[PDB]
């Protein structure tokens, strides 16, 4: 009975979701930060040398 209760609420409250894609460029994101920003390529190459 408990499983049937679970199944009923699942079918009744199920929803087809909106499926979205978001692309994030880390160089752009780090450069556009308000307070503590930096440049990805410059800091990456500096840290390797």
């Amino acid at each position: 009975l408990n499983l049937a209760e679970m199944e009923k609420v699942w079918l009744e409250r199920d929803e087809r979701a909106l499926e979205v894609t978001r692309t994030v460029s880390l160089a752009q994101f780090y450069q556009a930060l308000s307070s503590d920003n930096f440049n990805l390529t410059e800091k990456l190459t500096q840290f390797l040398r």
Binding site: L11, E12, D14, E15, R16
Partner: protein, 49 residues
């Protein structure tokens, strides 16, 4: 005067009209009006028939 013999024995045979037989007692099934379940509007599932 009381229709007895010299010894006091009665001279007329009496009667009492024997009680009228046993009695039959019966039981019976009793039924009453009974209703049925109702139907509500149905939900729309997300899956096909």
């Amino acid at each position: 005067r009381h229709n007895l013999s010299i010894d006091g024995q009665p001279l007329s045979l009496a009667i009492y009209a024997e009680p009228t037989d046993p009695k039959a007692l019966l039981t019976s099934m009793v039924q009453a009006s009974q209703g049925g379940s109702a139907v509500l509007p149905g939900t729309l599932s997300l899956y096909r028939f």
